Amino acid sequence: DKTGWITHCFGRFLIDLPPDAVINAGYYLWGDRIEYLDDKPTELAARVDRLEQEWRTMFLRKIDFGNESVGLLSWSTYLLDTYVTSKPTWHVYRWKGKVSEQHAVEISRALARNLRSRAPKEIPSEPGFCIDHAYIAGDSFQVERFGVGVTFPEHPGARFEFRSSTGAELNSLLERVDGFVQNMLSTFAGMETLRKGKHPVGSLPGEEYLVAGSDKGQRGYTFMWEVQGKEESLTEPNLTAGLAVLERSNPPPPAFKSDKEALELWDTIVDSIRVRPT
């Protein structure tokens, strides 16, 4: 029942979500956030001038990365505050992190070359990591990560989460939580396991663990899905999806009509996860 559902790009991946989904996302490159700013060109130049004035009231150097892109180098190790623009369509991103130097400038430079704009409804055919209104073009390895939070107007109290992060996790999902869940199940008769095992989606080898419980007049859920990931892989990073309904204060309206409804939403979203074909 995917009427009106929208395919979204996050990082290297696509996922389908219902049309009324409320979505929040963060993106991280070599461990630091890359943040969309709505600055126009003169507003960006004014922002940079203000920051330089303030750092003088500590400051070291202003660096041209080329493409109307610039970074400010100060003391925090340095602090490199990079402002980078997408092409062809103008959008500004801030990318700020600590630096112990020539290597970081080169990374900022490559970012300024590689950052491409994308239209709102566009799924790029070129390789790259999608962020807000843009994508970092290429398919050479880089440390990259995102997280997406999602709420659903028709399911109060429900939250869904989708994340990728390069590098293998040190354990798998079933290894990580099975003892914990078993202790829960033997403590609380309202607690059950709905499903435990594997949930592949195409080539993505997801482990899956779905629990639910009833108490205080409410029914809560914690659904978990994880690809452990491989080292230095863009397309099989650590990858997770989760859906939770936790305690809400007063008896509040159910998040779902039944476990089956909850499981159908879950499966429909999870089965839509795939590497973006490029």
Binding site: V177, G190, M191, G213, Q218, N238, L246, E247
Partner: peptide, 25 residues
Amino acid sequence: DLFASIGALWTWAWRGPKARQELLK
């Protein structure tokens, strides 16, 4: 408490070591 356990599972216990460091930044 049942919902406290569910909450512990969601906020911390199912998050792997790498994902915990990332969430805490």
